[PDB]
């Protein structure tokens, strides 16, 4: 079959195989799974801790059917350094983001649409129909990339918990 999202298209072209693939990240847990994507490595570093040595969501993420909602390298970039340099120390304002960039439940790119709930606690206004998928105003780059026990839905915006 085929995945959902635009990037998912080009993505493959760039990373058709390997651990940074839809299948590669599968053999691995949501964590390492997203800790291979050349567009998640950034986000992961955060959750994991690489970015913030005061945070760690690798253990969590890799626990219970989740659904990564992951801010591509284009999402974070948009954000100013000051912000990033901040997430490289914070452990509450940053986590909220990460958490919000994940949903505990797991749902194909069909129902995921609508006001969902992120492991964080806030709601993630998902959207999309066919050849289009959005999330929290973001743009589902490549969604439906089920890893080991959690889905993956790359976006182009550093989703944030509205609360």
Curated annotation (Swiss-Prot):
Entry annotated with the keyword Secreted: yes
Principal location class: secreted
Gene Ontology CC annotation, any one: extracellular matrix
Any GO molecular function: cell adhesion molecule binding
Keyword ATP-binding: no
Record localization: Secreted
Record's keyword terms, sorted: Secreted, Signal
Record GO biological process: cell adhesion; extracellular matrix organization
FAS1 domain sequence ranges: 27-159
Subunit structure: Generally found as a monomer; homodimer in culture fluids.
Protein name: Immunogenic protein MPT70
Lineage of producing organism: Bacteria, Bacillati, Actinomycetota, Actinomycetes, Mycobacteriales
Gene for this chain: mpt70
Interval of the full protein contained in this chain: 31 to 193 of 193
């Amino acid at each position: 079959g085929d995945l959902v999202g635009p990037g998912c298209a080009e993505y493959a072209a760039a990373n058709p195989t390997g651990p940074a693939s839809v299948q590669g990240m599968s053999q691995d847990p949501v964590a390492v799974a997203a800790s291979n994507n050349p567009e998640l490595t950034t986000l992961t570093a955060a959750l994991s801790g690489q970015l913030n040595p005061q945070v760690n969501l690798v253990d969590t993420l890799n626990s219970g059917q989740y659904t990564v909602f992951a801010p591509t390298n284009a999402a974070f970039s948009k954000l100013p350094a000051s912000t990033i340099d901040e997430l490289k120390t914070n452990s509450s304002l940053l986590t909220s983001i990460l958490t919000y960039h994940v949903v505990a439940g797991q749902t194909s790119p069909a129902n995921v649409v609508g006001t969902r709930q992120t492991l964080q606690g806030a709601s993630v206004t998902v959207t999309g129909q066919g050849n289009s998928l959005k999330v929290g105003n973001a743009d589902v780059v490549c969604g439906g990339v089920s890893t080991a026990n959690a889905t993956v839905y790359m976006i182009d915006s550093v989703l944030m918990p509205p609360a």
